């Protein structure tokens, strides 16, 4: 019940690279920001080669939403699957970390940040209506995104003090924060997209 | 006009009236019928030549075909071992004409294991573009069909719209059968009966010449 | 063996035995008929079509026909205004064949006026050579046709039992009438070739073509 | 009941002209003659321009006499009963030498001219065609075929007047009458009939 793309092309292509990428840098760009970060870059990003896993659990007629979605903005398909990724999606975010431990604006540092080993787990539901194609998800959203390692890199003057690792602590699961917000809000149902 | 009255000399002159004859057996036609199907299911060539006939009806179109599926071979071909049966055979006038031609109307049923085994595939895009289809075996089946027909005289026949057909539909995947794939089946079937074969829309084919002529005596 | 089994399997899957069923009807087939039957009448130049379809025949095979006649003009011909009858219709094994093959049997009935109007003469040798051949307006005609049919699909089988009724109705004219031995003659050559080409032991084979619906032959109106 | 050959198709044949002075002058040269007539002998012949008349008034397929000669040495066949009437133009001219005796024997040898002429014929016939044997017969009985003959007599100027010479000639004219009535009677009458090839 398995779907083995040799997804070959995604670990080459530049152009889905810079459109994740850049649709992670203008994520970057709108979202109301903490004071204690300054700037927040997409420094570095790749989808990896590791294929996620998905099966066809069932197969049904569309839902009363997808039709709602037309008419607003016969004889189609849906397919109810299940979704695993516990592959290797690596995102590398610049951040300039505002640190006011001894007093306010103290000092201005460069940050890196590595999200890592995500793993994501859910129910899917992809609808094709001869031929628009809509996605959406299922599991309660945000705790769906339950896998990620985000390891920070300061400078090395800077690695002793814990004071430091405090407002790195805080920007690491403020931007976990964001990111199960943005998976939630984007995907979760009743939540659906369009133009995969 | 008036050549309503062509159809009266025929009706007098024939032993029938239209409102009072009954219906007539029809078994003789159940009988040759049945030996000319025989004969065209013990030719073991046939299955190949259907084989690629339905390869070759689907070769030319793959754009009124749902697009999530992909290409399609037939794997599994059986055409039966019964026979169709007959009954209840009328005359009646043809309709909107005003009462311009005759037809006969002929009641059908028919029970057996009608089969046919697809394989196919299922893409997506435009991710990635193109999707790990997953494979489809679908062996279909239809196993009763009841229907009212109309023939007349080239040959004129059709079915009514209130006809019955029963469809009986497996499909495996990669290791349990769906409904929704036999009622799209279903879909693509009644699709082309209804298109080429029920009211209002009839078949004409070419009548041969019966008279006898020496290029048409053997024996044996 | 085995083909006899699949008569077998025939006949079962069919609602009827050979033995018991009785006799079917048939008058549907007699509607049907006369309506193409009525279709072929009413061509206007279907007429002028067969007078020159058995004028070509007869003169290229009239060395079989009697050698003291002339040239045999068709000056009047016509149809009838009445329809073929069937009924009594049954199937039985094909004789001779040790139950290989099935065929239905119909009785056939006709009554109308069918007739052909011919012109001839009577030549003579060898004085002088070539004689004052006498002229003959030789109109023929068909009453009764009663036979006993046999069908079959194997093509299409049929022919017609020895024991037939065929009813003349002659006449002859002469220079200046009800002359016997005319219509005796024709009737030997109007049966020659009916014997010949559709009469028991010999059928006649028509094609079959293919009932397969095909967008080809999809009309509508 | 119709038939009409002007039938002109005999006058072009010379062929047919000799074939009836060949058959015709050796049915003369073959004959026990009497002692007054020395020799007789076809000279000129001809068959005219009228043609007899003909009336068709029965038909049946057969006669079983003509199979009976068949089968010595079919539904198919034919056998027509007509009526003839000859009264055209048949004309005979037989040479003869007249061997005269009045006043005692072998008195004179005449050079002699006989003519037959305005031969009237009436009788029935029977035609059977057995694809295609043909065969034909007549049936008039008693040599009654012959109905109206004339048969004038050309001889010498010199002798045109002695009524002695004319008993002679007549003995000779109406012998040849009789021979011609036995002619036509054992040749064609019932029962007796011929093919023609």
Redesign the interface.
Known sequence: ?????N?S??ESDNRLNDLIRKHLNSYLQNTQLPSYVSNLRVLDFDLGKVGPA?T?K????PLDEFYDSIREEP?D?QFLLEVEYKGDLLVTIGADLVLNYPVEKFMTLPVKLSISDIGLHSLCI?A?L??Q?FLSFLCDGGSIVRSMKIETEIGEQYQGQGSVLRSVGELEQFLFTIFKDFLRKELAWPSWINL? | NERSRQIDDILEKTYYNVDTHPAESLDWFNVLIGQTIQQLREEAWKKDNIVYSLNAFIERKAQELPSYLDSIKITELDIGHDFPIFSNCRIQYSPNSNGRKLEAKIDIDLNDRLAVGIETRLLLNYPKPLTASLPINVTVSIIRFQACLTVSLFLMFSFAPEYRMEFETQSLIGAENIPKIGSLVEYQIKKWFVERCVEPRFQFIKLPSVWPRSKNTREG
């Open positions: 019940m398995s779907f083995d793309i997804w092309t995604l998905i066809l069932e197969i049904t007629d004889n398909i992809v094709c001869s031929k194609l995969d």
